[PDB]
Design an enzyme around this catalytic site. Structure first.
Site, mmCIF file in Angstrom:
data_model
loop_
_atom_site.group_PDB
_atom_site.id
_atom_site.type_symbol
_atom_site.label_atom_id
_atom_site.label_comp_id
_atom_site.label_asym_id
_atom_site.label_seq_id
_atom_site.Cartn_x
_atom_site.Cartn_y
_atom_site.Cartn_z
ATOM 1 N N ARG A 125 57.021 11.071 -54.767
ATOM 2 C CA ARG A 125 55.906 11.972 -54.552
ATOM 3 C C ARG A 125 56.003 12.449 -53.092
ATOM 4 O O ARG A 125 55.951 13.627 -52.820
ATOM 5 C CB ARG A 125 54.627 11.170 -54.771
ATOM 6 N N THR A 126 56.172 11.521 -52.161
ATOM 7 C CA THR A 126 56.266 11.844 -50.747
ATOM 8 C C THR A 126 57.538 12.577 -50.380
ATOM 9 O O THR A 126 57.524 13.550 -49.606
ATOM 10 C CB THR A 126 56.205 10.572 -49.895
ATOM 11 N N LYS A 166 70.659 -8.608 -45.998
ATOM 12 C CA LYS A 166 71.426 -8.912 -44.793
ATOM 13 C C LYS A 166 72.838 -8.315 -44.733
ATOM 14 O O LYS A 166 73.834 -9.036 -44.565
ATOM 15 C CB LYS A 166 71.498 -10.445 -44.593
ATOM 16 N N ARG A 225 61.014 6.530 -44.414
ATOM 17 C CA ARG A 225 59.885 5.780 -44.956
ATOM 18 C C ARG A 225 60.341 4.342 -45.005
ATOM 19 O O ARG A 225 61.503 4.076 -45.280
ATOM 20 C CB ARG A 225 59.554 6.260 -46.327
ATOM 21 N N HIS A 240 51.390 6.493 -41.128
ATOM 22 C CA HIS A 240 51.854 7.460 -42.076
ATOM 23 C C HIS A 240 51.126 8.752 -41.649
ATOM 24 O O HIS A 240 50.487 9.432 -42.463
ATOM 25 C CB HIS A 240 51.466 7.007 -43.471
#
Ligand SMILES: [Zn+2]
Ligand SMILES: [Zn+2]
Lengths: 153, 310, 310, 153, 310, 310
Positions: free
Chosen positions: C54-55, C84, C105, C134
């Protein structure tokens, strides 16, 4: 005057009214088309003789007049019946159960997918007849069924 | 302006003949004279709620060959970990506000149509909503038949394989039934034969059709041979096997095919078509693919360009 | 040149009022006169160590509407199989040498900030580092309030939902507290009420605020209604349920709202807002979305263009 | 009393019937309490102002003796209403809806995880009174909810 | 026949004051004079719809020690990994047709109870059903208490940790409520205080309880300390850290500790109980743990045998 | 020594008419006078290469009830989750070196049979091998029939559901074929009719069978109704719905039902058999289910003991 038998009812006030409904099919039309989402006289009664081989149901509202077509969208359920809108004190409009092009919000594309399920939308099909039954095409899934299969879970 | 401006592409069923011929016309024209900047400054969501890379790439390439930019996703099985945390409608509503067009694929039938009622004036193009439509495939099928056969009228078409669950097919046969002439041949096992409703619809337009047990019968008389992959899971190992390598097509079987005749397959294959075919001159299943670029490229132009004329 | 050239966008906290007004100003201007080539020849990494399609789409669309090209990834749960085998720093260092900007993000707090100290002069824009910032969301929230309310000063704002764990909120309320006037209303259950530190910070700038049990109280007096999804997992089935369909918003409840009043939601929803709202005229949660394109689009311009003036 | 009165609101033939039921809170009862689910005769009157005026819904059953149990379970919705056992306009009895002890089959555990949902069993709760609420304990899920919490759905 | 021969075991509530006594005497009686053939030729179904090793071994071990044969399964099997498979109704119907007893653990409140209406005369014993009942924990706890204190009345009980969600605490403070002269001191972060419903029951019974912020406060006169852990996920990762104040015991806080005092904990334990505690003579979470082999052992006895002489 | 002492149990075919009789008498004899030490000091290997709880508990339960010790495993273990691990040959070689009997279920046809040529004198009992044999189902079915009908000859048997893939049906109609005066009425969707091979065997034996579309048709004179389910995946999600006509029993269709009549079903059941049926006295899918503890119980006896006196 003064013969022999009893009664309590007859042809009452105004509003659109209904004639002939099979048994156990009465109540249906109520819940199904939201025939109480109001405050008008929605008095009725089921399983009373009016001319048939066993049973028959009738309806009675006032102040509310059916869509000269909505009638249609109502058909199917009561095979044969009548409306007879009652504008000002007496009979004034004979109608009959004829098939609509479509029938919305009342049925369910019996297809576990046919998208409209968790989705906020009105179930629209498509009426079509032949002989052994009636067919309708899922507006969304484009999958056709017989009114029987659709009428159930 | 053009018949198909700002309009949705959902089910093959709802496309006029003029409609089709238009897209095809564009196709072969866009093929002929590549216009890489027509769609300059347009953004298009390549939404794949149901992963189909093969499809995504194809579509997405047309989006590119036209100067358009692309953004999207392929929410697969490790993305679709959510069955109740965003309704399609809401997604369409949101996504409908960023882009100029929506090419979406979906696991479920009805999706494309639905998205339509929640995309404002933004156009949606169904890339396959469940087992329903996928107009995009049908069109490249077509496009491919016409360009190889010069016409889509009065033709002998063979359809081989899992005719019962093969939508691509149903879709094509319907489209074809939109043209005159044309005689059909469906050689598929008994438990995967062509469905009745299709037959009837051909019964109605008075369309020539017969069934066969093997392509060898008809092979001599077909212009188009359309192969479809059968699947083992549509039957059972023994069953399938006991007929698999039966409706397969191998090089030896083309000894009596027409020069013009071409073999087709929506792909992917695996069995249906022996490798030795890929060399004969009838193998057009790959040309059939690259052609989906001019079918899908053509479609976006028409829907997004107000008026097109090469 | 412009105040925000070559600068990082990490925490909403560190943005001057002049800072904000600038971005917003740009926003509505970029909205007004779309400049698809401003960012021609720039490449920007859309890095999503923590998947949020969505972002990603939203951001990535702004990257496109500006003539910029994009390359990145959405290293989800089937990509993050390595705990790692590459430190963030090292990744940022490497990635910092290919692109012109980094929109990242991250599942973890502090990431954006960290990346900053390893990106040379390459700019980084935090799309959500853990449960911290954000800024990108906050700005479109804002942008949306202003354009609908004409101002961001002297306003009545309602904040409904899981006020305790909703960062989007904390962030917005802080930003708002950067303007005069403004009276706040926080209607959230007792175990998810607004945090003290927020209240205090409002206590400090002498900012009007009261708590309520249901939106009905305040409903009559609010310009902005900000809905946030509650989650069942922040409580328990019974608990939640016993209050869920309590702080939900349905159509019937807007009978006394102001014409100007608008309903908002960072989305996705599910319960908080009944479907029948989507039609009233107060529903702006979707316009709120498409507006994140001019907030995020505006931000990239400012950071990447030396001097901007429409 | 010649001044004002009412045409409807009758009292005909043998059958146990009710009286005085909230407005738009009676239809909900027919369904909820598998009523029509029989092929017997019954007249209904909705939006009918009783001898008490306060808009109410109302039935009229034929030969179907009503009882204390299914009776108590009629509160909640129409707390104050009456059931007089008739034998042809014969009030051979009556009573009122005293809040029952249990209440199975008709409600739903608001608990998304209450086991009741997907399984072949009858919803069962528990009744109790608080300042303004009515405590109900999902018999299975064992959680206690508010009567208005459960009825909202 | 004893008051529990052939009865089901679902809720801690469904147990009379006089009952608990029987179960306990029994349990101790089996700890002194063990009866390996008590349940010989009896077959029990250890059913773990909700996988949980710990309780499975304890239970099954406290099943072989009575010559009973075991059969069952952990995690989701014939019915998937969390989808469709068949009703629990239908499962219990089938299984109860071949075992002499059912011991089932499940993830949804009421599974044991539902099962009871489907096992015919086959007893069902709840091994915890979601956030509802877990009768063996509360019982194995009590016994342990009874054993280190000599009585279950006129006692000071402390309960630390997450009490708002502590399944095992609630029923434990429900049961002890069935006794006289018990004084309760609850210690927990506000975000997670003792449910109101519990307090209300404590007062309407004349029971004395007080709340605290730190173990130290009541440490002085407590006979029993009941530790519990608050998993991180029960609070913001940072929230947790902050108030993770004294809500985790450390041996240094046990000087003015009543000699008779005992530390208890359902387990597993993560942070709340430091290792060094394990040395002192108060640590009983372990001995408490192996005691549940007698509580569960007693239950099976009581329920399956009638003239239970031990 | 009995005709089966030390013999293997793989196919329903490998069973003589006279054999089935022995197994059954036995089974009933163990239902009247149960022998808990019959198989004392015998160790069996419940091996579930193909994970399947249901059949595992039934089988293992019908293993402890004879004092036999059990050991085994469900799902894929030492050999993976569906890849490389080692031959079945090598597994059976190893395991048969320490158990007194093998009970294995596997996903590929012939595993039990293959195993037999590798277990030395250790018996192997097939718990179903892919789409081949599942001897205990067919046997537990029969017994049930024999018990509710008193005979396995001169009977009317109906079989509903998916008969084209019904593993359990085929062998059941194979076995009953080994008897006299049995009349068969098959009811199923055409897409999934009874295999031809079966009919051919029915006729070449003078056996009477007829096909139907609806249960009602033959409902009248049927002594046994054998229900089966057609999983969705056996047909288009929509195909299924359409013809999902009467192929699912509902109590309303049982008025002119022969009192002796019994409804049977291997299980699990999904839709085909409505709940309300469970009340009537025809529902036996459950009693049939617990009967298989005696069939399997009998088998173990027969095979492991010789002078089997019960
Ligand atoms: Zn549909
Ligand atoms: Zn419950």
């Amino acid at each position: 005057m003064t013969h022999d038998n009893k009664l309590q009812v007859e042809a009452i006030k105004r509003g659109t009214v209904i004639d002939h409904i099979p048994a156990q099919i009465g109540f249906k039309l109520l819940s199904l088309f939201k025939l109480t989402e109001t405050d008008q006289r929605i008095t009725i009664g089921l399983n009373l003789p009016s001319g048939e081989m066993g049973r028959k149901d009738l309806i009675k509202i006032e102040n509310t007049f059916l869509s000269e077509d909505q009638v249609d969208q109502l058909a199917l359920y009561a095979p044969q019946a009548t409306v007879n809108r009652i504008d000002n004190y007496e009979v004034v409009g004979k109608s009959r159960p004829s098939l609509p092009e479509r029938i919305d919000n009342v049925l369910v594309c019996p297809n576990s997918n046919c998208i409209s399920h968790a989705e906020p939308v009105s179930s629209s099909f498509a009426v079509r007849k032949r002989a052994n039954d009636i067919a309708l095409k899922c507006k969304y899934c484009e999958k056709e069924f017989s009114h029987n299969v659709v009428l159930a879970n | 302006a053009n018949p198909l401006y700002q309009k949705h592409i959902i089910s093959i069923n709802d496309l006029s003949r003029d409609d089709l011929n238009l897209v095809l016309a564009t196709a072969a024209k866009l093929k002929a004279n590549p216009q890489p900047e027509l769609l300059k400054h347009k953004v298009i969501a390549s939404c794949f709620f149901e992963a189909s890379t093969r499809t995504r790439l194809s579509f997405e390439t047309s989006m590119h060959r036209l100067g358009a930019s692309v953004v999207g996703f392929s929410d697969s099985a490790n993305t679709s970990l959510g069955k109740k945390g965003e309704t399609l409608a809401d997604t369409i509503s949101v996504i409908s506000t960023y882009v100029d067009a929506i090419v979406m694929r979906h696991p479920q039938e009805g999706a494309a149509r639905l998205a339509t009622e929640f995309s404002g004036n933004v156009p949606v193009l169904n890339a396959g909503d469940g087992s329903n439509q996928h107009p995009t495939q049908t069109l490249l099928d077509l496009f491919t038949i016409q360009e190889t056969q010069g016409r889509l009228d009065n033709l002998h078409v063979a359809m081989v394989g899992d005719l019962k669950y093969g939508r691509t097919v149903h879709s094509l046969t319907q489209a074809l039934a939109k043209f005159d002439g044309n005689r059909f041949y469906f050689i598929a096992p008994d438990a995967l034969a062509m469905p009745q409703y299709i037959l009837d619809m051909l019964d109605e337009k008075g369309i020539a059709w017969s069934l066969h047990s093997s392509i060898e019968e008809v092979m001599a008389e077909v212009d188009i041979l359309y192969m479809t992959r059968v699947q083992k899971e549509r039957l059972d190992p023994s069953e399938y096997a006991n007929v698999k390598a039966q409706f397969v097509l191998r090089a030896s079987d083309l000894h009596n095919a027409k020069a013009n005749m071409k073999v087709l397959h929506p792909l992917p294959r695996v069995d249906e078509i022996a490798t030795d075919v890929d060399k004969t001159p009838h193998a057009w299943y790959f040309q059939q693919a690259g052609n989906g670029i001019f079918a899908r490229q053509a479609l976006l132009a028409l829907v997004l360009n107000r008026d097109l004329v090469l």
